[PDB]
Amino acid sequence: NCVADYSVLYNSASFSTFKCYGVSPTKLNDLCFTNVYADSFVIRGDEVRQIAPGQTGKIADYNYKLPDDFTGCVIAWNSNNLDSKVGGNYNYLYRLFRKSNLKPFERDISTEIYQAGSTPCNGVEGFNCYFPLQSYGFQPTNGVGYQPYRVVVLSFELLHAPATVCGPKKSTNLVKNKCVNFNFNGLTGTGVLTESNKKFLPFQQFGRDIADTTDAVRDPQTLEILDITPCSFGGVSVITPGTNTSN
Amino acid sequence: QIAPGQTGKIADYNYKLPDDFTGCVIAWNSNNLDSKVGGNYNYLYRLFRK
Amino acid sequence: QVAVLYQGVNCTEVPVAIHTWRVYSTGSNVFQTRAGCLIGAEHVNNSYECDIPIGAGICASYQTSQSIIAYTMSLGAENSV
Amino acid sequence: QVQLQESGGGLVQPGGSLRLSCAASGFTLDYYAIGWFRQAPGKEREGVSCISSSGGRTNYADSVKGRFTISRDNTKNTVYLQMNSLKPEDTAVYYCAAWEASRWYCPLQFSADFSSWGQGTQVTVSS
């Protein structure tokens, strides 16, 4: 339920990571989104690559898994002077050991001590009993691969639902009966619009009677329904006599 | 940021390479020749463009 | 009422492999044809025209005891001159 | 996608030992000659040791002559630097780099430019 301007957000100290999969950043403003999810955490440099669809690693399989069909953009800021302290900022825990891998966007916080051996640890450390969540020793003098990185993943769903977050593109006046390139809430197309006599259910937006083309649409500004017809086309054939007969 | 098909500050505002680029980029570190104790400001850097 | 034909498989196998509707051994006589395993139809010694082509000379039809029957096709009324 | 990763560093006691692993992804490290480099805080990058692409030619530094050993596993696309009898003078961040032959003759004792610099690992010797 917001009008977003990610273009201004892009010019932010030229931060290194703007990795958007499924959407190009420059064209990102024009497209608009049904919902937005912002997921934030702090990572190490060498594990930065693990934040990607279809990527392997400790964090991907044990801490934070992204879907193979992930659509969204990962952003990260260097946090050496913010999250790293001289004595070590051990406030961040990473799950090194898990009984099974993680599904995408799965956060099932389990603090149990995993049993490395056959004897049940029963929540008690000892022989073959190690706690998965290990702290991280972030220091300003630590290496770039061992220094904090503030990571936010922005996940978006391009479902066929009334979008809530759209960029600041101003809607122009409606034109009727002339073949135009229309953009209705991210749905782009080309054709001629006409007044439709169809009835739409109060929760119904589109209409497709042949299963691939949306013949009808509902405008958000004015609730009138509009049916869409292709811009017309056709081959051109040439009727001629023989060349030396005439021209 | 010199390689074709990649987007960046140099790739978009300093040197854009075509998609069908046929040639070789050559690079070498220059610390004993270019870098100067007082700082070599003589090299320019364009960041903003239409 | 319908019948189900598993094409090319012995009947000592149908009820337990697949993982929906079930078959049940008592659900029919579970006929065994050269074409496969047939479920839901009886067997009639009489022969008529091929109402429905099943295969290997077997044809099925509907009669008002399961409503569907399967028989050996009759090539035609016998005649001698 | 040409990545070099330094793995195996840490804080060690003088007189001990440690092993470094340089990992290559996205390209063939067998075709590249590898040479480790160190830059201690307040010290310039001095050559650790260089090993050729085939592995038949080895370079060493007199500061670590007889203490640092280099081996490569071209099948596993890794080059290992084995360190023995460590001293506090070796407290530095370590990089592994890949480059070709700079001249005639097989050994690569002469330093030259280096293409791919890894993230690097800091190995600290103090007790």
Added chain:
Amino acid sequence: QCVNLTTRTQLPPAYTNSFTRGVYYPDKVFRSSVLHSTQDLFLPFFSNVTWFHAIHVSGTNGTKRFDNPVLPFNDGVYFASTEKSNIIRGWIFGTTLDSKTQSLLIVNNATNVVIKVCEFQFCNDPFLGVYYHKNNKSWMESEFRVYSSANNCTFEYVSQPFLMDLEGNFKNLREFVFKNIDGYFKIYSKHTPINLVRDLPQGFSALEPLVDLPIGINITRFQTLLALHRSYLTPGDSSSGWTAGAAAYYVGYLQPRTFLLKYNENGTITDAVDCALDPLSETKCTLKSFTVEKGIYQTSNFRVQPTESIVRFPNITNLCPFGEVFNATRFASVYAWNRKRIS
């Protein structure tokens, strides 16, 4: 607060089925004179739903005990209600139904509606009681004993006060398709009038989406709130409730199947066919039609699956000469070296 009621006695209820009921609109698109196949979680045709009387008379004397036990919540529930005196007032959802975990609540406050999400301390027997007396002006005075306390509740909703009551077989039926998916609480609902009925009748009606609620919480259990026409302090035996709990509700559990829906020219869902019910239904689905002419059709392919995986390599050998090495009485010196060969 709350009031402790009597034991439910774990009474055994009867059962009934939805004969082609519970189909809703799974999409926000409009189709005219088409047949469509949808992979979605529906209520299976002719499946058995468990039916609960609002008031259960263990004896005809008036031994009336409320019947509203806790029920699991897996992939949403279909809820039907036949009634004419608004005995059902709402529902409560959660995992543990206490302040230990987050929970959700929809209630009817006498004449308004209320939607609240937080960690309510629900009591063991939540209910709404209403009672009247001809003397003075009582006229359905109410006690609300649904929960104990509510803290840090995020979502709130109130509405206008309007609903009449009697304070004659026009038992109205209400259908709901409560489904929590993607942190949302879709509530498909349908209100229709029927008369001359004792149990739910056989009929067909498309169900429309009333509202989506953003709650984003874990849900594994649910309950219901019934309007008590009595009071625990002075509980009467007979006629204290409404027609001995003849008005009742029905709970069914949805399953993920495929359906063939028939949109007419008006876009109103008219007929539906469940593919996974009968071989004839499979034939109709594979032909994308409702009528099939005489013949033989091939629907699917059947294969046998392996039961257990078996790996074997040849163990075939002798034991191995190890005990004579480790368990040997004497060991060789460090210069006359004893190596034993093992193969």
Added chain:
Amino acid sequence: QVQLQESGGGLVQAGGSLRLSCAASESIFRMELMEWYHQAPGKQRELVATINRCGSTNYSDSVKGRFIISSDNAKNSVYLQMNSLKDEDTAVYSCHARTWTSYWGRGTQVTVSS
């Protein structure tokens, strides 16, 4: 998985009462039709009673008024309470239900002494 199995027949006196309990493992309601047939000795099988899914019930002339159909919807079964039995009702009573395909049980014997 015997299905449509019957039980409740045997020796009985004239004018008595008896119960038989044809019950099936499959869902009772999906049947949409189940009936009753009996085969008197030296007599071809004859329909006794019927019940569909809607609830409509028909009986033959020698059925009405004496024993009627019922089916408790708690345990899947159909109930036909034999009442005031006569000597000409001695037959092999069988129950039958038909989903997409027909089903049949072995039936049960009923004998009346007079």
Added chain:
Amino acid sequence: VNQNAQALNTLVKQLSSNFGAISSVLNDILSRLDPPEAEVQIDRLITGRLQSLQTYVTQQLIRAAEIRASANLAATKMSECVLGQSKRVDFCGKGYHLM
């Protein structure tokens, strides 16, 4: 009448599959991604659609050949059974042919 239509229907339906890409509609990709990855998606899309069109063309060619054979038979029957009296057995109709 049905066969043709059915085939053509399938052709249109083939436009609704992504063919291993991330979308089945071209304008979404064209308005979402930069050309370097756009082209990587478009090549898959055109490969799939071109394969479908080739299959449709081959089916139409075979069906047209069969219809040509049927039309030749019909022309022969019109030339012989109608324009004159035929003596070929069972060519025109059962029994001795009159007209």
Added chain:
Amino acid sequence: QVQLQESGGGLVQAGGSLRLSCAASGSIFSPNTMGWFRQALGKQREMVAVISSIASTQYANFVKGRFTITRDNTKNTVHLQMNSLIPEDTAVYYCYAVDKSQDYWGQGTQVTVSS
């Protein structure tokens, strides 16, 4: 912003006892997990017990058989009961609230026992 109200530190002789306590005054969405972490100078963080409100115990082997945790469900407060301390165990303890959204940390409680 969840504030962890830590208190209950000080100086105690060998073999003594204390009663630590930290309270979560934040929103506390959904089930939470309550933990205690031990941090000594020149060392890393070692947890004490991350027992949740329900079960799983989660007791370390370092202080096994000496320390116990009491929970008050009314105010969502956890008290770290302290007894039979060995001077090796002296370090800085931090309250740890896991919650559903993100984890929080306290301001630290000093524990020092020697003789």
Added chain:
Amino acid sequence: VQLQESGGGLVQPGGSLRLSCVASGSVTFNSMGWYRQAPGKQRELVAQITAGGDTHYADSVKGRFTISEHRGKNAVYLEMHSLKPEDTAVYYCHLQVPFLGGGYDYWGQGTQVTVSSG
């Protein structure tokens, strides 16, 4: 979400305006209401129309407001005459969808009407 609403603009005192809760398709109801609220005060009813046709009005809007219904376009319109500066507010159209004997009106969307000499 269902219903959507629009319409309404700023005007001078003593004029007449034409507000509308624009229809969103065929929906069922019995009582269509017009509602208002201004900052610093609670929200009060403006008008109400039953399915039969009975009208209910606030005291301050007597003889100055008229409600009309259009089943052709399912639209409910309100023509307001004799505007005084006290009428500046945000306006809503509350529904009568039957939900458990009646409830869940859809007034949640509003249109801002400002009446002032400047």
